[PDB]
Amino acid sequence: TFKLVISNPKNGVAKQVEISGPEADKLIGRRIGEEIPASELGLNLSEIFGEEIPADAKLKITGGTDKDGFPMRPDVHGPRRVKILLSRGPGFRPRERGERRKKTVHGNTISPNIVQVNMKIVF
Amino acid sequence: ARKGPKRHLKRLAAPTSWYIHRKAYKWAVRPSPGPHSMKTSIPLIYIVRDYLGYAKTAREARKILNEGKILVDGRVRKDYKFPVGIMDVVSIPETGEHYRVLPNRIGKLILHPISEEEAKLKPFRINNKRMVKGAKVQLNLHDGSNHLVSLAEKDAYKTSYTVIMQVPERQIVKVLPFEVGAYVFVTQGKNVARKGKIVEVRQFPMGWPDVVTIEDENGELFDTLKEYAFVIGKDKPEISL
Amino acid sequence: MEIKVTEIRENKLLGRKEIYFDVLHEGEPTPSREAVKGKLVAMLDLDPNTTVIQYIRSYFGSNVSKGYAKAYETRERMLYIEPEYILVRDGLVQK
Amino acid sequence: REIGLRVQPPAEVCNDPKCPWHGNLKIHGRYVEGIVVSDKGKKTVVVERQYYHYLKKYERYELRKSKVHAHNPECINAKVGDKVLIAETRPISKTKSWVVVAVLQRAE
RNA sequence: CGGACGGCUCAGUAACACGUCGGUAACCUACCCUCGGGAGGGGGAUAACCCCGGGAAACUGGGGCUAAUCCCCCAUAGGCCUGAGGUACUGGAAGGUCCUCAGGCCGAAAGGGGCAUGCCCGCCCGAGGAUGGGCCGGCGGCCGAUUAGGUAGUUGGUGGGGUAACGGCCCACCAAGCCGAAGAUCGGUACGGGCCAUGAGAGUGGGAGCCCGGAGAUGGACACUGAGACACGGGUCCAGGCCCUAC
């Protein structure tokens, strides 16, 4: 079960929806930086985004969040967790010059441990 | 343990050249770096407040200072930490007052009142010399200031001579050399604030400074160091002591 | 009570007249700020405003107290230089 | 170069840049006289001098000795027994900060 | 911009840690002063703000829009190395500064803000000083021989690396030196001084409170940012202790 936040870089609006069942299993194994059609999952965008969006449009996975509140970092390979002592973003906000803190992040791959998934519409 | 420089100063640790009460309080104004040294200078707020008595607190002193009502060497000074030193001139034009800063026979600094005519001149002691790009000569003076001169007239400026200069615009007049008949005013040591004429110089080997003998007008002789002998005249003074 | 001015002093930078005076009260208590101000202004031709009393002080056995007063040219320079606690203590400002 | 001590230079020459004469080493500070005690190292000498310390309680004195290690150039090649003059300089090794400048009297 | 000061304590340390005299011609320095010179031409992102959020929390994700005394790039000044000459400066004394030539690496800047019809506060380079520090040296100050030999990068040299800088500080090679009965090494106790108590004085004893210096922030080790820290109220790990939890 996933909550999709689908955002358009055309108007600046986003919509939240749900996905459950076998159409969800098409995401597990996928990574950040990979493109996916919208019908592959079982939803059309003119229905929900509002007025009209053409067909043929695909979606790009940009981020996500684990069920415990730990976000995904593209440059960390795997569907697992890590503590890495990073210095910038995503997944930490410095609040000072030269500040570093060892943080808990999820990896570059999607897994059933996830709740949130951020998608960007491509044109 | 200390990880850096100091920013405070306690009153029991203040230099002896000051007229200050050491037990009344715990804290003193730490001067800021500037022209003179710490053992040879006193800030401005102490002058405004404890010497002349134009203020009883420090807010009032800051307030008069931030309005250009006090000058030092013909220049406005708004910083209550600025160090004032020997041969410097304090001017209040709203009261017509002009003072020259000098030490006592005890080693403490005072204010000698002078006139508006002599308030426009300041003597300087040449403390070193350098050659800088453009083939020019740079004289390094005794207040940490500097002057530029051409190569053609380098032999006329040496490392103990004295130079009189209009203070604000900083133009030279009346160089004075270091010879065997020049008038002198001692600035540090055991014989501070004395005055007389030079008699003899003496050099020594391998790092030890040079010594000079002096004769006061009562006829008595006394020695001191050559860097402590400020030259102010040839046969008589040019300023008021 | 008698009031005897010992010293007046001029200040051009802050714009004030500083006044050191003695009070003589033989057999009476230490007088009040209102009375001392009244006498000062009556005797030196000053404004009941633009004038503050910094302190009235009594000593061990003297029957002779001392005072310090300041007279300003302008109420503006006054409110700018002087702090508020003496102004309230005198009555020239309401907290 | 004529270093500032008013002694006479040696009647030799060296290429070592660690010699006050003939080289780039510069001297400053104090200078003393002593006697050579040992020269078993290469271009290194051990110098000794003596003085008297005073005991305030017993109103008497006490002879004390002082040892230093000094650089020894090859134009001025001192040996055990020489009365010599040493001067202070920058740290040359772990235990050497003085240098020999002139032999005042050579032993037999 | 500042938080590296101030404030607390006396564990460790018998040491160039402290005191005093000297030195750096072997070094660094934001705020400050003086003098001499400069501000040319282009580009970019991103917080706040709007849409949608997730997690028990602590914390934190995606998309759109935007500015600077924010960030980046060209140029010119300037910084550093080396070689060959000239000898103008200081100094007690030039592996220093200045002049000329040559071959090369790095490489600035905010004419911004305010008042006003020029004044106030400011930006960058250089030469010097001041302020504050790092390093070196001579002298000086406990007890123990039921502790007598210790040291093996240990002592020096030649050549180099690295440091802000000299240096076995570290490395490669050649030698056999260094300390010691005037007591080394080892062990014990202990922050050092100005000072204090006592005594006729010589002298004996102590050194918590105030000042100057040093060291530490539960034990120990390691790093980032900055002129400056291996950083009490900032970071990482191990050990040992405690707390919240929806585990």
Ligand SMILES: [Zn+2]
């Ligand atoms: Zn030689």
